[PDB]
Amino acid sequence: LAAGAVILRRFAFNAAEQLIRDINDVASQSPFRQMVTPGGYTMSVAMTNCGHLGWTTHRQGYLYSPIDPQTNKPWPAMPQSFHNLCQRAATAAGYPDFQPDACLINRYAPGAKLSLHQDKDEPDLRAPIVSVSLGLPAIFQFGGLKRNDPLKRLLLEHGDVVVWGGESRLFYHGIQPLKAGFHPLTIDCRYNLTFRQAGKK
Ligand SMILES: Cc1cn([C@H]2C[C@H](O)[C@@H](CO[P-](=O)(=O)O[C@H]3C[C@H](n4cnc5c(N)[n+](C)cnc54)O[C@@H]3CO[P-](=O)(=O)O)O2)c(=O)[nH]c1=O
Ligand SMILES: O=C(O)CCC(=O)C(=O)O
Ligand SMILES: [Fe+3]
């Protein structure tokens, strides 16, 4: 029950093996790292980016940068497999004009979590975010526009795609501590890809 959200279960199941290979290729150029929040805390989720712009912490805040601050080189180009999956998902959900220029890649080891937050660094909050889940299952939690709104929970499994549009694009959301387990393609972790329109164009 999330206004504006389109859940496409197992939409990415047939693409997962290529997606994971391309994650590894991206990570060999811009490695996974645990960023430090403006509050001074080290995140348990490891992240990297591909595309023209990448989400990062920097100067005690959040922003999109064309340079990876850990490598001092541009983020790797967005793989074609990523772009094609995102476009197919966005078109199926009713957002044919969506043109992402950034993809944040999250890696969750057992016990890793992501506390409640909103995604508000993008210039046009009318553009959706496309989320792709790979590997171990996670409990996704989301509330509302206010931090105190009631929480709902949704299990996200390998291959699930969610297009967060309309009101749901602005919900507070997070991930609960990942349960340990085995997945044949990721072994012991979960990956999440979130495609964003980050450029002011
Ligand atoms: C309070 C406490 C914590 N910890 C540990 C435990 C915790 O996991 C770790 C920090 O990791 P995090 O889960 O809180 O990550 C934060 C950053 C993340 N976030 C925000 N904006 C975005 C965004 N646009 N995108 C794309 C992605 N992620 C985003 O959401 C979180 C809240 O953000 P903000 O605080 O509101 O700035 O610190 C302690 O040990 N002791 C303590 O007392
Ligand atoms: O892992 C997920 O499914 C959500 C990730 C997320 O909300 C973010 O990185 O902004
Ligand atoms: Fe988020």
Side-chain angles (χ1 to χ4, degrees), residues 2-20 22-58 60-62 64-72 74-86 88-119 121-125 127-145 148-151 153-178 180-199:
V6 179
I7 304 161
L8 305 168
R9 286 194 174 83
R10 293 171 67 85
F11 189 88
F13 190 91
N14 291 332
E17 202 160 19
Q18 182 62 46
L19 293 173
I20 288 159
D22 283 334
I23 288 170
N24 292 325
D25 180 56
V26 167
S28 76
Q29 306 169 64
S30 278
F32 283 107
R33 82 297 305 264
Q34 289 171 248
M35 301 179 186
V36 185
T37 64
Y41 291 101
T42 294
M43 296 175 70
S44 53
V45 64
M47 291 168 163
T48 189
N49 296 273
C50 60
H52 298 346
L53 290 168
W55 188 85
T56 186
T57 69
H58 195 66
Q60 312 170 231
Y62 307 118
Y64 285 98
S65 180
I67 303 299
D68 179 343
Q70 182 150 124
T71 65
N72 301 302
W75 304 101
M78 188 179 297
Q80 186 276 329
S81 70
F82 284 28
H83 187 272
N84 180 256
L85 179 77
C86 180
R88 289 176 55 247
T91 295
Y95 291 95
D97 298 320
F98 185 59
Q99 294 190 99
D101 54 11
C103 181
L104 179 63
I105 309 174
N106 296 5
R107 184 185 66 194
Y108 299 81
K113 68 184 182 178
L114 183 58
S115 305
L116 288 179
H117 65 277
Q118 295 175 303
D119 281 55
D121 302 309
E122 301 68 38
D124 184 0
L125 300 174
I129 288 173
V130 179
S131 165
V132 183
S133 291
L134 301 166
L136 294 175
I139 302 166
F140 181 88
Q141 58 178 23
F142 61 100
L145 305 168
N148 57 278
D149 285 327
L151 282 172
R153 293 175 179 84
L154 197 67
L155 190 72
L156 292 179
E157 305 177 291
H158 178 74
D160 288 347
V161 180
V162 182
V163 182
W164 300 102
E167 201 182 327
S168 77
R169 170 69 176 77
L170 283 86
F171 288 172
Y172 281 95
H173 60 277
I175 293 284
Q176 302 192 170
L178 195 73
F182 174 85
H183 192 274
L185 288 181
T186 66
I187 303 301
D188 62 352
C189 71
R190 173 180 180 258
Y191 297 100
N192 177 257
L193 316 179
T194 47
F195 296 86
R196 304 129 181 287
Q197 197 173 285

